[PDB]
């Protein structure tokens, strides 16, 4: 519900909240300033990252990761394991002797920031390489594309 659900106070490290709030200000409404950055490579910052209130230190827009290296794509298959999803990347492997292909796949775990709210199984995501964020996570979700949906019953 609220964002302070941990044992330690959750805050963006580069925002000073206690900026001498005195009688000349309104009580309220006050809204504490939000740190966000523009990652390069022509990727738009989602508006939910602009005026959201989540704290995520591994978010590419409001956190302390920097995207560099490889930009890949895949299809969401699991959405357990909080703030992290499993995507599947299918590809064809060429075998020279029979001069045909075979179908292979690899899973990678990627960090899904809470600026992407309506993410479902079967969606196509764009991921960017960052520094190691955990034992197995090295990529971070940059853009979510819906697949054959947008209309429900």
């Amino acid at each position: 519900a609220d964002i302070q659900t941990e044992r330690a106070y959750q805050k963006q490290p580069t925002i000073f909240q206690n900026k001498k709030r005195v009688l000349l200000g309104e009580t309220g409404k006050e809204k504490l300033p939000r740190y966000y950055k523009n990652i390069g490579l022509g990727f738009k910052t989602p508006k939910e990252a602009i005026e959201g209130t989540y704290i995520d230190k591994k978010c590419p827009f409001t956190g302390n990761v920097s995207i560099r290296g490889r930009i890949l794509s895949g299809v969401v298959t699991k959405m357990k394991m909080q703030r992290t999803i499993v995507i599947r990347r299918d590809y064809l492997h060429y075998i020279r002797k029979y001069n045909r292909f075979e179908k292979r796949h690899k899973n990678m775990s990627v960090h899904l920031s809470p600026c992407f709210r309506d993410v479902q199984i079967g969606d196509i995501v764009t991921v960017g390489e960052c520094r190691p964020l955990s034992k197995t996570v090295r990529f971070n979700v940059l853009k979510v594309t819906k697949a054959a949906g947008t209309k429900k019953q």
Binding site: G40, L41, G42, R68, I71
Partner: protein, 262 residues
Amino acid sequence: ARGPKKHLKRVAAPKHWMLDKLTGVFAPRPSTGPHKLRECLPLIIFLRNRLKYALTGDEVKKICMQRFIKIDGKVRTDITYPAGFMDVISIDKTGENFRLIYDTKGRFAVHRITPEEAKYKLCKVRKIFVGTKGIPHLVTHDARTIRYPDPLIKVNDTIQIDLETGKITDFIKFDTGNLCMVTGGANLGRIGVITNRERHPGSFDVVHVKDANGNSFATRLSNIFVIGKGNKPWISLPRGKGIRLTIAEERDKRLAAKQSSG
């Protein structure tokens, strides 16, 4: 390996050194310096293999220890000192004043320049940054750190510095239509005029170059050394002028030359 390597096997040496096979197990192993290992020419092979002023390494060592070999105006007594590109070697007992620039086969050619030309060199800007107390610096393609440069100078431009002061004399910007030399890769040693630079964010920029004969080629931005304002080089180009001949027309030229002199 538990630490840094100090040897270099003979077949693992750079190919453009043109070392043979049967005369040893080892290669000269250039010392640490202002040039990279694969992109340099240690003094021993320049003095023994190209100029043939010596026949062994001991002869190289004693003509170095007699303290007349000058690289960029300073006396160097280290026989495996990396000489590197666009660097001036002055003997000034015999009075040669070479300069190290690639020929069109990608190899360091013997190129004699005049004594008035040996005062300066061209350096390529690889970094600009502001040091403490707000004073700017730049780092060249050598290890040279120039303080207080012109504020118009940006990265991967070239600057003409003069030796024995280290000061910047003049510069040209990396711009479309300027003369350049390729300093690495497949087109190493070729000279042409910049026509296009298309940018790839994250990745490397590729620059398209057209030479005098209209043979257009492309290479990475890191292998571009601008050498002249628009069309006129600021240094003396070597024999062949950076124009790469195909094997057929080079065969024809060689046959015509041996027919004239034979």
